[PDB]
Every structure is written in C-alpha cells, then in structure tokens.
Subunit: 333 residues, 3 copies
C-alpha cells in the first residue's frame, strides 16, 4: 500500500454519488477521503417535528464513497470542537478493529486518519459506533454507504457485463421521536437532552417516522430523482438499523444484489427486494416508460404513513406495447 | 398485440387457481380477465370481530390470474355503484403508470380496461392503490397474485423441468382492527367510519390479527387444503404489506422462489422461506407422508395467536423409512 | 435402517458442538441421541429479571445434534416427573407427523423414542410444539439446531471444498417478560402462573429482551467465543420464532447459507445476513485480524438495548495491510 499512487476524491451530497469509473484499466490506489461530523437539529416532517440529529458531512445519509476492489480507503474523520459528542467510524467493508471504530475515536476538536484494504466488492454500510451509545448515534443519522466496485465492473449470473448510466444513493432512517403527555412530539434544546427519552422510544422497536435521506418527502417535488427512458439507474439503498423492502412502483429490479455483494450473482425481475438492517443493497433498472414512479419501502404503512417513499421523474416516449389503456374509466354499460 | 388471438379466462375463488397449462406449445395471446370490486363487512375471527373489508371479486385475497411469459393481460375492472369508494389496480407484473393504477381509477358506477405485457415470469402481487389511501385499501383486503409462467414451464437450477400437480393460493393479511375504551374490538356501521381509528392502529405497526384468506382458520376443517402422497403442490403465498415466513410443518420447500421470480434458480430443502411485504413467492413440495400438515407463518405468535396458519390434509401410505415411532410414550424405566 | 450400524453420541452444551466429522468415508448409520427436558426459573439480565423457562437438556438453546445426510436420527426424549408440563419435539429436518411432534408427546414421568431419516443437508431448527401451547414453549426456550452435513462435506458455488476448524452454536431468543403496574418485571412462583400474562406480552409482538444463549451477555467476558488468526469458524445461528440479522463487527460472512441448507450455493462477502424466524443459518469466517469482535443482531437496538450480542476474542498478529491507523486521534491542525 505504501508503494501505491494516491488519489483524492471530492465527495458529493446524497442522493448523488461522486464521479467514478465502473470497469477500470487502473491498478490499485490509496483513495483519500475526508468527512466532517456535524451534530444539528433537523426538521424531519411536514408538521415541524424536529430530530436532534448527528451526521457525517451534514447529510443523512452520509455521502457514498466509491472505490474499486483492491484499492485502499484512507479516510480523515474530523470532529469539530462545535460538536458535543465523541464519534468514530465502523466500515462494514473493512477488516479488523471493529471496522475501524477502535482506531478512529475522536473527541470534539480532534481528527483521525484510518486506512483499510477494500478487498471485497459490494455496497457496505459505514456508521458511527461510540462505545456505550452505538444505536443512538446510528438512528440519529450517522450512516452511509461505501461502494467497492469490481475492477472489471458489474457482472450478471452468466458473467456478462452490466452497467448503470446514473447512480443514486438512498439512506433509509427509522426515527424514534419521543412525545409528551399532550401527545405532541418533543423538541429538545440540546442533543444530550434528547437521549433518555429517545432510548425509551427505541426500546419499543416502533419508529415514529421512517424517512429517506433525512425527511418525509426528501426525494419528491423539486428534489425527485430523475432519469430517461433507455437509461439504466443504480439505486443504492442503505439501512444501518432496521429491515426494509424497496420497490419501484411501475418498474422492477432488473438485476438486484439485495445483500449488496457483487461477487454473488444478482437476481432478476424482482418486484420487491429486502435490505437487512445493518446493510446496503443495490438494484439496476433500465427505464422503458416515461412518467413519475414511486420508489418506496413496501410496507405501505411505513412508506405512506411514516415517510419511506420518494419519486423518480422519467422523461421519454410512452410504449403502448408494454401498457395501454384499452377503455378509460366510463360508466358501467 | 393487436395481431394476436384473444382468450377469455373464468377466474376461480382462492385457495384454488383457475385451470391453466404450465409448459405450453401455444404462442402469445391477449388473455382477458374481469374482476368486480366488493366492499363488505366480514367476520374475521372466532369471537365475532368484524373487518370493514374491501375486496377484488368478493374474496381475500383476490383471485389468482395465470398467464404465460409474452402474453398480454387485459383486465376489465368494475366498481359497482353499490360501493362507497374509488379504486384502481397496480400490477407488480406490469411496466408503467404506477403498475396501471393511473389508468384504472374507477369511481363507484364505473369500469376500465387495462392491457399490459406480461414480459417477466414469476408470481407478482396486484393491489388497489388509490391516491392518498393506498395502505388502507391494501390492508382492508385489496390484493391478489398474477402468476406469469415461463412458456416452457418451471425449471430447476440446472435447467431441468419442474412441475406441480395442483396449485393453491394463500393471501396473508395483517389486519389493524381498533379497540374501544372497554378493550373490545370496534364494529363500524360503514367503511368510511372505520378509517380514522384504523389509520391510528396501522401507525403502531402492530396487527390485531394476521390471517390467511380472510379469517382465522379459513384454511382448516372442511376448508383445509388437500393432497396425496406422491403429488406435487405449488403453494403461492402473497403478502402485499408485511413480511411473512412460510413453513410446512412436517414437510419442506423442495424448490422455492421466495422472491417469486421464475427466471432465478430456486433454492432447495428449505425449512422456512421469506416473503417480503409487497411480493408473492412460490414453493413446490412433493408429499411423501400422509397426515395433517400445518402451513403457517413461523413467527409462531403470528401463526397461533394472531391467525396466520392453515392445514393440509394428505392421503396415502405411511413411510417408516422416513419416520418411525421406535418407542411410544411410556413411563421412564 | 434396520440393516445399519448404530452409533451413540454424547451431546455437549452450547456454544460448543459435539465432536463430528465433516467429509466422511463412513456409510449411513442410525445415530442415537438422548435429551432430557428441564423446566426452570432462569435469570436473564444484569438486573435480576427472571424467566420461567423451559429447556432441552437444561440449556437455551438445546444442544446441537450433528449427523450426515442419509443417516437416521434416533432421539430418546425424556420428560422427568419433576416437570409440570407435557412436551414433545418437532424436527424441521424430519419428514412427517408434524416433524415428529405427534409421535413424541411426553407427559411428566414419560419418555419416547423417535427415528427419522436425515435425508436433507443443512442446519434445521428443532423445537417443542405441544398442541395448544406451541409459541409459549418455543419462546420460553425449547429450541435448538440439528445439523445434517453433506457426506462429502461443505461445498462452495463452484463445487470446491469448504471446511471449518471450530463450530459454535448460537440460539437467539426473543423473550416476553411481563411487567406489573409499578413498571418492574414480574417474578412468578411457578411456570403455570407466568402463562396468561406472558401470552398478553407475546401478542404485542414486542420482546422485552432478545438474548443469545439464555441471558444478556451470555457470550461475553469469561464466556466469549474464541479463535485465532487463520482459523475458520462456523457460526450456527438459530431463531425458532422471530427474524434476526447476524453480523460480525470487523469481519464478514465469507460463505453464508442464510436459509441454512447446504445443497444450495452459499453467498460470499456478506456484511449482515438474515435468519428467518423458524430456521437456522450457517456462516463460515476465516479470521485475518486479532482482537475482540462483536457478533450481534444488526438491529442495533435489539443488540445493545435488548441483549442480542456476543463477543469473539481472537489471538494472533495484526495485519497493517488490511487495516492501519495512519494518524491516531489528535487535535485538528
Ligand atoms: Cu457518532
Ligand atoms: Cu455495523
Ligand atoms: Cu381500493
Ligand atoms: Cu405495490
Ligand atoms: Cu415443551
Ligand atoms: Cu417449527
Ligand atoms: Zn446504459
Ligand atoms: Zn407430479
Ligand atoms: Zn481451516
């Protein structure tokens, strides 16, 4: 690793993913990243409910980091003195020392640099895991995805090449917002004051909200995902704490790695797939119809009542072969 | 599609599935179906609890529709003036327009005809999805399965032929029946009056009942499924809203497509498989022993306490090679 | 089976597994086991909460039974007169008579001997299932694993040999301990007195505790699992009632059969896998780094708050290629 060239990557905010190659002629590199932790109060729904949140780089999820199999990830993790809590990082893509958590314990005002070999292909969760407060830091927003691409790109079960034209990253967050005796959600002045009441809600195993990318409706309206007929999209879906079941309404998972590990053959033609709590999965889809799709957790209560749903707006020409309204709604003859 | 022959299929009520070919020499057809929505109050347990239910064709689940890959499904959906609500249909097997929901919005007194290409093999959920009330219509009973068989029939991982001699269809329904201050389940005069209280229960993510085919014990006694030693059964299991884990007590899943898509290789020898909320899965089993089996969700609380269990009564000759009582229960020597 | 040699196996307590061969030159045998049921009050957490427990052989889980495909399992099940309840056993690995439950109904003071053919390879749950009280006996602790190894040992997707150097067995138990009006957990004088209150908690679908091998912290401290760099461990994980998502913190599932059936190809490089309620799964991992790992259910609330987490202490030499602390935590420059 000490023999290798270094490259520095500039991260981009979800739902985008930073520029990268799929199949590459390049040899292994030490790939350098930096992230800065930000604790902040965030508004998470349409009625002004707040979360005392904790983030990598100011977003939920943290940004997606992309490397190739055989690369080394070298992350500088910064915990500004403006934060109240200690933090660290655990990479599921890494081997040893609790995913790196033991080597990256940063108090406010400190930083650390971790290197690990990305020797396994796939999408992998990374998350904060400070001893004694792991689930709180995770459910408060401290997770994201590391994608390790095979050096020769994605492959189907027969070893044929697969690709995406655009990648989107979706972090799904089960939130545990406490209520007061009046039945309204509690607003806390500081992160520390949210703790005890939040642990109590967590222990019920019942989320108050389940959101994509930090808020009900985050991936809707002006902020809907976009694509065009004929384009192949990769949808990366991470859930660091709780199971989810992604579904594209009006579409499919053409090729899906629901356990998120690219050396395994993908499944095809899925209606709904399953992302295990503590993992990231990946689905390819090539659009064949224009229109607005929903991308959601298909526990429909979790999607429509609790917030786990987004939109994809797709341009292009309608295909009557695939679907046709033979008779529009009309009175029964 | 406009060049093709049409065929009309008469649907049958669950747990049966309408007559169809597996492997077929026939070419693609436009396959015509009709379903009529029925809102009705249904008794769902042994103690007289009622559900303000919503159904395709008067049953939970709706009937299973069977076509072959490359066929076109052409469904006439009828919403009689006797119903109170608007409805539509979203086929997970279809491509575009939110699965067809956008093209089939029928007010009471109206009907519509949708065509789509069944270009992907597998078992696929279909369900109602009226804008603004999706989870309510789904959990109240509006879902069923479309099975798209490969034109050359089912195949094992090595591409060898597989078949079933009899097919059964099981829809599992997580129900959310509200209670009054007295702790008894509420009975509502109309469908609309159940709504607000039901949404509140839904948001707890805790079903009051979880039933196969519309009621606790639906598939038991006179209504148990049946088979014989040597017969291969296909068990289609749909759950449009919540995860389940089917298990045949005393048997196995010989070949299982738990994600329900036939172009993927099945798994063999399963004890328990997993049907993701928002999907239908399929399992083959060849009976080797006579007797009464249970087919259930193997969260045993969900099965035995909440209602997610049925029976299969199997005729034939006992096999002592497979299992033998060496010593019957007797006092400890 | 009446032509075959018999062997008698002495069972060992979890988390160990009794001595056995993987690949074997031996032909099929009748393999004889005995287990004795023990009802007992057990302390399940650090604050003195008790469970009115029910066990195979005095442990949660029951011991793991290991045979080879084509062997016959012959179990003598003993229910001492000191117990209060009737019991039986249902082997998911068996064919017929509700897994053997119908043939092994033993009142206190009785015993029975069941034989069945272990004709399917994999890890399979076994559990008590007395008519009318199935979920109670299961959640109170009456489950364990039968492992049926292929006669030629484990194989990867390409049919290459796989092995483990050490096997550990982990039973995960969702517990349903009732509380009194004071908010403290109830302590019951007898097993029968726990029943009604426990059924009420069960019906909420919310466990009070979720534990590995009978107690919070069971597999920690003096009782942590152990291994060494270069050693391959098999981690058998059973959950007879509820879904779980195992994860090795700082490691991976090198080869995983999450549905637990060895005739299916395993998946590689998993971060987190999924064990369906009512099943046992198996994961291989070869250690590459020394240190203390956590092995946990990656619903981190379930792990850290409710008890579903253990430790593995690993000896050997640190590998800087795999992971290196480039800069230890230090003030931000
Ligand atoms: Cu943190
Ligand atoms: Cu983790
Ligand atoms: Cu409807
Ligand atoms: Cu749907
Ligand atoms: Cu028992
Ligand atoms: Cu069972
Ligand atoms: Zn493309
Ligand atoms: Zn047959
Ligand atoms: Zn070894």
């Amino acid at each position: 690793a000490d023999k290798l060239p270094h490259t520095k990557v500039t991260l981009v905010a979800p739902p985008q993913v930073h520029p990268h190659e799929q199949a590459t002629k390049s040899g292994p590199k030490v790939v350098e990243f930096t992230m800065t932790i930000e604790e902040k109060k965030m508004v998470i729904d349409d009625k002004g409910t707040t979360l005392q949140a904790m983030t990598f780089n100011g977003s939920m999820p943290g940004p997606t980091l992309v490397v190739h199999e055989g690369d080394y990830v070298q992350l500088t993790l910064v915990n500004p003195a403006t934060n109240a809590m200690p933090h660290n990082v655990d990479f599921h893509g890494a081997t040893g020392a609790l995913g790196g958590a033991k080597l990256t314990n940063v108090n406010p005002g400190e930083q650390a640099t971790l290197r690990f070999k990305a020797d396994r292909s796939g999408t992998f969760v990374y998350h904060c895991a400070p001893e004694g407060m792991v689930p709180w830091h995770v459910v408060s927003g401290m997770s994201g995805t590391l994608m390790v691409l095979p050096r020769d790109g994605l492959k189907d079960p027969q070893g044929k090449p697969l690709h995406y034209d655009r990648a989107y990253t979706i972090g799904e967050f089960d939130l545990y917002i406490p209520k007061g005796p009046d039945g309204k959600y509690k607003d806390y002045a500081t992160l520390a004051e949210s703790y005890g009441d939040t642990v109590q809600v967590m222990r019920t195993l019942t989320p108050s909200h389940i959101v994509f990318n930090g808020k009900v409706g985050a991936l809707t309206g002006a902020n809907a995902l976009t694509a065009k007929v004929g384009e192949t999209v990769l949808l990366i879906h991470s859930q660091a704490n709780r199971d989810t079941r992604p579904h594209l309404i009006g579409g499919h998972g053409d090729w899906v790695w629901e356990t998120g590990k690219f050396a395994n053959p993908p499944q095809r033609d899925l209606e709904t797939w399953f992302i295990r709590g503590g993992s990231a999965g990946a689905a390819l889809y090539t659009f064949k119809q224009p229109g607005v799709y929903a991308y959601l957790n298909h526990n429909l209560i979790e999607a429509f009542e609790l917030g786990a749903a987004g939109h994809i707006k797709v341009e292009g020409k309608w295909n009557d072969d695939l679907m046709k309204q033979i008779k529009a709604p009309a009175p029964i003859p």
